[PDB]
Amino acid sequence: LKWSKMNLTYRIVNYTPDMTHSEVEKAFKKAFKVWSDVTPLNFTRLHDGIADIMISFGIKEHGDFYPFDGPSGLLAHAFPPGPNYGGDAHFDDDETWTSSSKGYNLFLVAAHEFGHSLGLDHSKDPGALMFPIYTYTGKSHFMLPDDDVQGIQSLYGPG
Amino acid sequence: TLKWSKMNLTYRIVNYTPDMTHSEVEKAFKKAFKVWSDVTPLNFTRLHDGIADIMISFGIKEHGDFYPFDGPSGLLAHAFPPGPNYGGDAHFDDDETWTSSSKGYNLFLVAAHEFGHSLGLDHSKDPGALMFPIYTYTGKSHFMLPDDDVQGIQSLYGPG
Numbered sequence: 001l002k003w004s005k006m007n008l009t010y011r012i013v014n015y016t017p018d019m020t021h022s023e024v025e026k027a028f029k030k031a032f033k034v035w036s037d038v039t040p041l042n043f044t045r046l047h048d049g050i051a052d053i054m055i056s057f058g059i060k061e062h063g064d065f066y067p068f069d070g071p072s073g074l075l076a077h078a079f080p081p082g083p084n085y086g087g088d089a090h091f092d093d094d095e096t097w098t099s100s101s102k103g104y105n106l107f108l109v110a111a112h113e114f115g116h117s118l119g120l121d122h123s124k125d126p127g128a129l130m131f132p133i134y135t136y137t138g139k140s141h142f143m144l145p146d147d148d149v150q151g152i153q154s155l156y157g158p159g
Numbered sequence: 160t161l162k163w164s165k166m167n168l169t170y171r172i173v174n175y176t177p178d179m180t181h182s183e184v185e186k187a188f189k190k191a192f193k194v195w196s197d198v199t200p201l202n203f204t205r206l207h208d209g210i211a212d213i214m215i216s217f218g219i220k221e222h223g224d225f226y227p228f229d230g231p232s233g234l235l236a237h238a239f240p241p242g243p244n245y246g247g248d249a250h251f252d253d254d255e256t257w258t259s260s261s262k263g264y265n266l267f268l269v270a271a272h273e274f275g276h277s278l279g280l281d282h283s284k285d286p287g288a289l290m291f292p293i294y295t296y297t298g299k300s301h302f303m304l305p306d307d308d309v310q311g312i313q314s315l316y317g318p319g
């Protein structure tokens with residue numbers, strides 16, 4: 001199961017008080033770039049209306065009955081490709097989101113989350129972005145692990 | 160396909176209907192799960208507390224979800240397909256007369272249909288399927304799970 005459309009659209013519904021609007025827009029745009037760079041997927045940011053992937057920040061009960069645990073623990077959850085809720089990614093605003101390392105790097109979490117949005121299962125490869133354990137190298141460049149490039153491309157193809 | 164990536168699923172009966180004794184309820188639920196485990200490799204273990212895979216509940220009106228109960232009649236019950244949290248959970252409207260007989264709604268028949276949902280079964284267009292959207296009573300310990308439901312559940316978990 002995956003996206004019928006190669007051209008997806010996302011909308012940053014709201015923001016975290018931890019980062020500036022640019023900081024968040026850069027994090028997500030860099031996050032989609034991770035996947036688009038290795039597939040035919042295109043991501044267009046939508047300011048208003050319905051978007052294939054609605055990005056939102058919320059705490060505890062936020063409208064889906066998968067409540068966030070608050071500070072630490074669960075950080076974010078995303079729904080697979082599909083209508084309505086599908087593609088959507090929520091970020092536990094009870095977490096300290098960051099561009100660097102102080103708390104939880106948004107770009108890193110968003111990339112993993114968009115993996116789920118594009119249909120990527122959690123990986124078993126300890127060195128894969130889709131591996132369900134948060135790790136941050138601190139490096140100022142991101143390489144998509146081969147596990148991820150393979151998994152995503154097994155869905156939408158390379159170039 | 161949405162299903163459970165494990166054959167061993169646990170279930171906890173959270174609260175209880177006033178209509179039947181604890182044992183009537185439990186028993187009716189046992190039978191309802193057996194309907195499915197008998198035609199697939201699915202194992203159902205009961206939990207008296209904690210997080211089970213299939214949390215059963217009897218609640219009226221707003222009972223904690225986007226599917227509020229309408230009181231007497233109408234929606235008799237609903238269940239969620241496989242998934243975390245509430246996925247797989249089943250809810251029965253306690254404004255409906257639950258029974259083990261034919262007077263009122265037989266907990267076993269509704270539970271079985273409901274459990275199919277938790278397992279990943281959609282509704283059938285086949286007027287004979289247990290998953291058929293409408294309610295029909297039959298009752299008999301020598302209960303025959305319709306061929307359709309067999310084909311559907313086994314497409315999910317294979318045969319016994």
Ligand SMILES: O=C(CC1(S(=O)(=O)c2ccc(Oc3ccc(Cl)cc3)cc2)CCOCC1)NO
Pocket residue numbers: 073074075076077078108109110112113116122128129130131132133134135136
């Ligand atoms: O995958 C998850 C669930 C969690 S998580 O919220 O903690 C989580 C979410 C995103 C993550 O993103 C990254 C994963 C790996 C790397 Cl290298 C970077 C970020 C990590 C954990 C919580 C439950 O257990 C599995 C992980 N959410 O999508």
Ligand SMILES: O=C(CC1(S(=O)(=O)c2ccc(Oc3ccc(Cl)cc3)cc2)CCOCC1)NO
Pocket residue numbers: 233234235236237238268269270272273276288289290291292293294295296
């Ligand atoms: O299917 C439903 C919802 C309803 S219901 O609550 O009335 C309902 C619930 C369980 C049922 O169980 C049975 C289904 C078929 C048979 Cl043969 C026996 C019981 C039937 C209807 C209400 C809206 O219309 C479809 C049916 N829940 O799963």
Ligand SMILES: [Ca+2]
Pocket residue numbers: 068069070071072073074075092094095
């Ligand atoms: Ca949290």
Ligand SMILES: [Ca+2]
Pocket residue numbers: 228229230231232233234235252254255
């Ligand atoms: Ca009702």
Ligand SMILES: [Zn+2]
Pocket residue numbers: 062064066077090
């Ligand atoms: Zn959510």
Ligand SMILES: [Zn+2]
Pocket residue numbers: 112113116122132
């Ligand atoms: Zn994840």
Ligand SMILES: [Zn+2]
Pocket residue numbers: 222223224226227237250
């Ligand atoms: Zn409910």
Ligand SMILES: [Zn+2]
Pocket residue numbers: 272273276282292
């Ligand atoms: Zn039903």
